[PDB]
Structure formats: structure tokens, C-alpha cells
């Protein structure tokens with residue numbers, strides 16, 4: 001009766017979480033946005049594909065979004081804390097409601113939950129890769145690469161998730177818009193290299209099957225040195241590679257939401273409700289397209305599900 | 319050989335068209351954005367649910383987006399003209415390519431097409447409705463209504479598409495967050511009024527079945543006068559109503575793209591390709607959720623389809 005009971009607990013203050021909050025304030029619904037401080041693109045030099053914010057800093061985008069909320073609305077609060085548990089209460093005075101705990105054992109109660117905790121990229125363990133990541137090595141040539149147009153050469157690291165001909169081809173064709181000399185690095189995979197040479201060789205694409213021993217990031221620029229197992233090396237203007245990802249936190253497991261084979265949390269059309277009623281997902285954790293515009297739209301629809309359910313629960317009571 | 323051959327013809331300079339253009343410039347693809355000048359929300363006082371742009375002018379959003387493109391990139395051009403035809407050429411020197419004609423019979427040729435021409439709202443023909451539309455009468459209580467919180471009363475016009483109990487209930491529950499006294503106007507529909515009174519009466523909702531003869535917009539504010547067929551009248555703080563829509567232009571018909579029962583152009587997952595190869599759709603014309611965040615994400619994915627196909631067509635050639 002005196003304990004705050006929020007309409008929604010939003011786990012994540014990234015693009016998805018902020019977008020959910022922005023829809024909820026319009027309908028006077030209450031929520032807490034939890035943000036542990038690390039966001040997937042925090043190391044990115046800019047944000048792309050989001051209207052008006054191209055080539056602008058991604059942290060400024062988040063800050064602008066939060067201020068754009070707090071400057072007018074007062075039903076959404078922001079908690080800069082690290083959550084370690086979320087549960088649907090199965091007993092006690094607030095049975096049926098959801099509860100989150102932070103690392104100091106503080107509690108928040110809510111009618112609904114939006115999971116917006118994002119994913120983390122699982123980087124290849126090639127010496128130097130981590131230091132080249134987001135400098136010379138890009139996850140998506142729509143989000144990066146334009147600034148490297150006219151490079152002497154550009155690379156595709158066709159390993160792990162990208163270790164298929166179709167993926168290598170797809171990424172090589174993107175890279176070809178930026179440079180006249182595309183090289184596909186297959187990192188010891190001779191079979192893939194042969195297929196690249198057979199299919200794309202006639203089109204001016206290079207296959208390189210030597211194992212990469214070290215990647216060296218140039219400080220000035222995107223350009224890197226690629227050092228091979230044989231002691232030789234070369235310079236490349238940039239490299240595209242798409243690491244596999246993993247959903248962050250223990251929350252999905254704790255709630256028992258169903259996962260998809262692709263790895264993201266299974267969603268119910270159209271409000272992205274999970275298999276646990278009253279729990280929704282938005283952003284990278286909730287689809288195979290882990291991009292910013294998807295995060296925005298998913299946040300809006302997740303908010304929609306919250307609004308519809310919370311409204312009905314309140315106003316259907318005489 | 320000397321005639322420009324764009325990678326994509328983007329029909330529409332709204333949220334969807336601009337978002338497509340913003341993705342295409344990142345990959346150096348060429349396009350023309352056609353904009354006849356009228357956009358669906360041009361009469362809206364502000365834009366909602368789009369991060370950083372809440373409570374800001376929707377025209378400023380578009381202008382910022384276009385400038386944010388033209389200030390850095392040079393592969394996308396904007397044509398302020400009215401198109402009257404789009405065709406996939408079945409003969410001549412550019413057989414297989416797409417072509418658009420404007421009202422002055424000027425031509426543009428392209429490898430692909432993004433249909434982003436939007437929809438138009440089909441307003442009820444109640445005397446005064448058109449003048450109250452976007453002033454006191456709102457299409458969506460997420461996009462409007464917050465500013466009317468605390469109104470003495472708020473209305474639901476449960477006619478046409480909203481002439482079902484579930485729709486009336488859904489909208490009435492949204493309105494109830496903004497006012498203590500919600501009235502559902504059924505405009506001569508006694509059966510719906512009775513169901514509203516049976517179900518929602520105990521919850522404090524009012525049903526009003528009298529035919530509305532005239533709606534009068536107060537100039538200062540959202541408040542309106544509702545004049546009934548019996549000569550009596552009342553004041554209401556706002557009204558929510560969702561007109562049916564219609565896709566704009568002859569383009570869908572000219573191309574022969576498949577339509578859905580809901581009315582929007584049928585889409586192929588995930589790049590929103592229509593049933594005509596090389597033609598994509600984004601925005602209100604392409605889904606049942608005719609909202610801004612949907613327009614943004616659809617534009618990005620439509621651009622994705624263009625990029626994938628155009629890249630393959632170019633670089634697969636030895």
C-alpha cells in the first residue's frame with residue numbers, strides 16, 4: 001500500500017530501454033529504468049541509420065533521449081545500479097508481481113517487465129583482435145566503412161559465424177563498394193579459400209588462407225597490419241567480421257523464458273511478449289537483427305504490450 | 319551509358335523514405351528521393367515515440383534528417399515533384415529496369431524501387447470532424463493526449479473501424495488514464511452502447527448513443543462541443559478515433575504488387591520485398607502498424623534488400 005508498485009521494470013537503459021520508457025511516459029505509466037552503465041556500442045565513434053543522429057556520438061544520443069524524457073515527464077525514474085535477479089513472486093503479499101534485486105539487495109516491485117539488457121560480442125581470440133575491434137575491425141559495413149572508402153584494400157575475416165561462402169561473399173560485396181581490392185581471410189580454412197577463388201577470383205577478389213598470428217592497429221587510422229603464421233605481413237584498410245553474441249545477465253534463465261535456436265529470446269507478435277506472461281523483450285536480446293532501429297521499434301511495441309495489459313488490469317475492476 | 323541509372327528510386331520523402339536514404343548513403347548506393355510535399359503527420363503539433371524528438375515539430379524532424387544526409391553524403395538526390403507512374407520496363411534499351419514519370423513527363427531509371435508513399439486517413443463525414451481532426455480529435459493516445467491529462471472528460475468515437483466492443487474498450491481504457499470521466503460515443507449504434515454500459519458501466523464508463531450532428535473545435539484548446547441530433551450538446555476534453563486509411567497513389571496498382579486483407583502491401587521477411595522482385599515497401603503503406611518507429615525500421619530493412627541485390631548484381635560479374 002505504501003511500497004511503490006511500478007507499472008513496469010525496464011532492465012536496460014540502452015536504445016531499447018529508452019524507447020520503451022519514451023512510450024510509457026506518454027500514457028502516464030510508471031517505470032524504473034535500470035542501467036548498469038555499459039552499452040553495446042559505447043566504444044563506437046558514432047551512430048548510424050538513426051535519423052538526425054548519423055555521424056553523431058552514440059552516448060550523446062542516449063543522453064539526449066534521457067533528458068528529452070526527464071525534462072517533461074515524471075513517471076519514469078532511472079536507477080544506475082546492477083541487478084542480479086528478477087523473479088515473478090510465487091508467494092507473499094505481492095504474489096504475481098515481478099521483483100528485481102540489485103547487488104546491494106535493494107528491491108523494486110512491478111506489474112510487468114521489459115527485458116532490454118542487450119547482448120555482448122564474443123570476440124575471436126586472435127592476438128590483437130580486441131585492440132583493433134571498433135578501430136579497424138567493423139561488425140557491420142552499414143554502420144562503419146564509409147569513412148574508409150578509397151582504402152588501398154579491405155578485408156573480410158571469414159571465420160566462425162562468417163565461415164561460409166555465402167557469408168564471405170555477402171560481406172566481400174559490401175567491402176567492394178569501399179575498395180578496389182578485397183581480400184577474404186579464411187584463417188587456415190583452405191576449403192573456403194578455394195571456393196572463394198573459384199567463384200569470386202574471376203571477379204577480382206582475393207582469397208588468403210594463411211593463419212593470422214597477429215593484428216596490429218594503427219593509432220592514426222583504421223588501417224591495420226596483418227601478420228601471418230609464416231612471418232610475413234601486409235597492410236589492410238579495414239576488416240569486416242561479425243562475432244557471435246550472448247545475451248547478458250542471468251535474467252532470461254531466472255524467469256525461464258523460451259529461447260530460439262538463433263539464440264534470442266522468443267517473441268510473441270506484435271508486442272514482443274516472452275513465453276512468460278507480463279514479461280516482454282526489446283532490443284538485441286529479442287531478435288536476430290541486433291541493430292539500433294530494431295531496438296527502437298521493439299521498445300515501442302514492448303511498451304504497447306505493457307500499456308494494454310496494465311490498462312485492462314486497472315480499469316476492468318469496478 | 320550516359321543516362322543516369324540509380325540503384326534505387328525511393329517514392330516518398332517521409333519518415334520511411336528518409337530512413338531508407340540514410341542507410342543507402344552509408345554504402346555509397348545512389349538514389350532519388352521523390353517528395354510531393356504532403357506527409358501524413360504534417361498537421362501534427364509534435365512527434366512522439368521517436369527518441370530525442372519527443373514534443374518537437376514533425377517537419378523539423380524531416381528537415382533535420384534530410385540535412386543530416388546532404389551535409390555529408392552526395393549519392394542521394396531529392397526531387398520535389400509529383401510522380402504519376404512507376405513501371406518495370408518490359409522492352410527497350412533498359413528492359414528489366416524500373417522507371418518513374420512525373421507530371422511533366424520527366425523520367426528517372428533505377429535498378430530497384432522502394433515504395434514509401436504512405437497512406438491517407440479517411441475521415442468520418444460528421445459536420446466539423448475535419449476541423450477538429452488533430453486539434454481535439456486524436457488518432458492515437460500514445461501520440462496525443464498527455465497534454466490533455468486532467469480534462470473534465472474525454473471521448474471515444476466508436477464508429478466504423480472502432481465500432482466494436484473490444485476497440486471501444488481498448489481506447490476507453492487509454493482515455494481513462496487522462497480523465498476521470500470517459501464517454502464512449504456510439505453515434506446511433508444502440509447495441510454497442512448497451513454492451514458498453516453492461517460491461518464498463520460498473521467501472522465508471524459512460525455510453526452515449528445519440529447521433530452526433532456537429533463537432534465544434536475550441537480555438538484555444540483541444541476541448542470541443544458535441545452537438546447531438548436532439549438539439550442538446552456537451553463539452554468534451556478530447557476524442558480518440560482511428561479512421562480507416564488508404565494507400566496513396568496509383569503505384570501499387572501499376573506494379574501489380576499483392577495486397578493483404580488488412581490493406582497494406584504484402585511484405586516478404588526480412589527486407590520487406592513486395593511480390594514484384596526488386597520492389598520493396600516501407601512505412602504506412604507496408605504494415606498494419608502505421609506509426610513512426612515502424613516507418614524508420616522498415617526503411618532500414620528495405621534499404622538492406624536493395625543493398626544486397628544491387629551488390630550481388632554488380633560484383634558477381636567478372
Ligand SMILES: Cc1cc2nc3c(=O)[nH]c(=O)nc-3n(C[C@H](O)[C@H](O)[C@H](O)COP(=O)(O)OP(=O)(O)OC[C@H]3O[C@@H](n4cnc5c(N)ncnc54)[C@H](O)[C@@H]3O)c2cc1C
Nearest residue numbers: 012013014015016036037040048083117118283284291292
Ligand atoms: C561497435 C558497435 C557499433 C555499433 N554501431 C551501430 C550503429 O551505428 N547504428 C545502429 O543502429 N546499431 C549499431 N550497433 C548495434 C546497436 O548498438 C544495438 O543494436 C543496440 O545497442 C541495442 O540496444 P539494446 O537496448 O538492446 O542494448 P544496449 O544498448 O547495449 O543496452 C543494454 C542495457 O542493458 C543494461 N544492463 C545489462 N545488464 C544489466 C544488469 N545486470 N543490471 C542492470 N542493467 C543491465 C545495460 O547496462 C544497458 O543499459 C553497434 C554495435 C557495436 C557493438
Ligand SMILES: Cc1cc2nc3c(=O)[nH]c(=O)nc-3n(C[C@H](O)[C@H](O)[C@H](O)COP(=O)(O)OP(=O)(O)OC[C@H]3O[C@@H](n4cnc5c(N)ncnc54)[C@H](O)[C@@H]3O)c2cc1C
Nearest residue numbers: 330331332333334354355358366401435436601602609610
Ligand atoms: C495527425 C497524425 C499524427 C501522427 N503523430 C505521430 C507521432 O507522434 N509519432 C509517430 O511515430 N507516428 C505518428 N503518426 C503516424 C506517422 O505519421 C506515420 O507512421 C509516418 O508518417 C509514416 O511515414 P511514411 O514515410 O510511410 O509516410 P509519410 O510520412 O506520410 O510520407 C509519404 C511520402 O510519400 C510522398 N508521396 C506520396 N505520393 C506521392 C507521389 N505521387 N509522388 C511523389 N511523392 C509522393 C509524399 O509526398 C511523402 O513525401 C501520425 C499520423 C497522423 C495522421
